[PDB]
């Protein structure tokens, strides 16, 4: 009913700005004010902000003044956050919410957008195979390795295969790119039977690879 | 500014148990009748999402197990029982006064069973050691308790130092974590050896599981 729709992940370069947008449908959208929430990896939640779209009346977090601006477009219900002299203290996800301006409560929120501040530049991964040796219970997965930024999507066998698959979150390698591997456990007997293919996508850099994973036969 | 000190930071109850999680305030949340104290229920990649607001309205769509409670500067949100889809981090926020302030939330971890973890190793692909690189991948497949120990062994001798580990959130299906650890290598140095190990201790395991390759083989 109630949908706030933020933009994707986004890779941004210090010294420069961004402006996430949060589009906002299902309501009135001027009878409720729209406020902006940071989240740091694995941190808490912290208020940057408040907009009334009835009049544009802003209030801000002491912490964010010179650092956010909110504005609203009454006519495409689409609220924004313009973030000016991006630091990698910015890296974070950024939340938008409804609220009532008066003691009302986040009923509503979007989905956040993540924002990469990184003079790094974009690679696209190699994807190479995690291949079992012929237990009962088998498991493979890929190595999807050396890319930057975050994320990159991994399906099996176009999305067909879900049950115990587990895509374990990114580490960032010394060399400053990231890796992750994505496994799934089948059945022993299905390596015989089911090719599996691990469907890789990193948008940042357009790239798409299937890999199939073969196993080795081991006597 | 409202501070909102919130206990504990992190709290294991198992399923059917009572989980209750405390918001303590610099000041009065009171105002003319009301007490603007919201908590909300943020699951790994999702946004936060309202439980409770005014301090006790349990949200349409919310189910009865959560109940919020208290007045003034001390409020209380209490799960009983406790389900397996409640594992997540969950906030306090005031909606008193501007700025709003949240507080620095509580991780609910679901205290299911013992269960030992399934263990794998992969040895790196041939596409992979073109490169000059070697990366061996060791798996410790839905496990419980979080606290695994595990080591590498390059023929017998335990490595440190040379290993980056990765592990999944708590599923909410089976309360279960996974773990995966990737042995970084260059090719020289793997073509040096021949026995690479992965040996898991856990609290699941009579014995320690150990799963291991001979590089040249299979």
């Known amino acids: 009913e109630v949908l706030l729709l933020q933009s994707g992940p986004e890779l941004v370069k210090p010294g420069t700005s961004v402006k996430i947008p949060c589009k906002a449908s299902g309501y009135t959208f001027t009878d409720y004010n729209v406020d902006w929430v940071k989240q740091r990896h694995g941190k808490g939640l912290e208020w940057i902000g408040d907009i009334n779209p009835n009049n544009g009346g802003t209030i801000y977090s002491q912490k964010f003044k010179g650092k956010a601006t909110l504005t609203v477009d009454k006519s495409s219900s689409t609220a924004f956050m313009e973030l000016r002299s991006l630091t990698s203290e910015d890296t974070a996800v950024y939340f938008c919410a409804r609220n009532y301006r008066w003691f009302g409560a986040m009923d509503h929120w979007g989905q956040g957008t993540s924002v990469t501040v990184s003079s790094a530049s974009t690679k696209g991964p190699s994807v190479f195979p995690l291949a079992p040796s012929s237990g009962g219970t088998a498991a493979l997965g890929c190595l999807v390795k050396d890319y930057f930024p975050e994320p990159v999507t991994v399906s099996w066998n176009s999305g067909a295969l879900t049950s115990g698959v587990h895509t374990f979150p990114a580490v960032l390698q010394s060399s400053g790119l990231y890796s992750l591997s994505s496994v799934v456990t089948v059945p022993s007997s299905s390596l015989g039977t089911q090719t599996y293919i691990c469907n890789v996508n990193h948008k940042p850099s357009n790239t798409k690879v299937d890999k199939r994973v073969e196993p080795k036969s081991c006597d | 500014d409202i501070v909102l000190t919130q206990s504990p930071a992190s709290l294991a109850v198992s399923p059917g148990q009572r989980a209750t999680i405390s918001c303590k305030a610099s000041?009065?949340?009171?105002?003319?009748?009301?007490?603007?104290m919201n908590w909300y229920q943020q699951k790994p990649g999702q946004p936060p999402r309202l439980l409770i607001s005014?301090?006790?309205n349990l949200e349409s769509g919310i189910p009865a197990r959560f109940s919020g409670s208290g007045s003034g500067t001390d409020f209380t949100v209490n799960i009983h029982p406790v389900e397996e889809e409640d594992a997540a981090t969950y906030y306090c926020?005031?909606?008193?006064?501007?700025?709003?302030?949240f507080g620095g939330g509580t991780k609910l971890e679901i205290k299911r069973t013992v269960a030992a973890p399934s263990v794998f190793i992969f040895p790196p692909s041939d596409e992979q050691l073109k490169s000059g690189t070697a990366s061996v991948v060791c798996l410790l497949n839905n496990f419980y308790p979080r606290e695994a120990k595990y080591q590498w062994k390059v023929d017998n001798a335990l490595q440190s130092g040379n290993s980056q580990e990765s592990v999944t959130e708590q599923d909410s299906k089976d309360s279960t974590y996974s773990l995966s650890s990737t042995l970084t290598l260059s090719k020289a140095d793997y073509e040096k050896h021949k026995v690479y190990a992965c040996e898991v201790t856990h609290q699941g395991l009579s014995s320690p599981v150990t799963k291991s390759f001979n590089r040249g083989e299979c």
């Open positions: 926020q005031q909606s008193t006064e501007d700025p709003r302030t």
């Open positions: 005014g301090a006790s």
């Open positions: 000041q009065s949340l009171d105002y003319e009748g009301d007490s603007d």
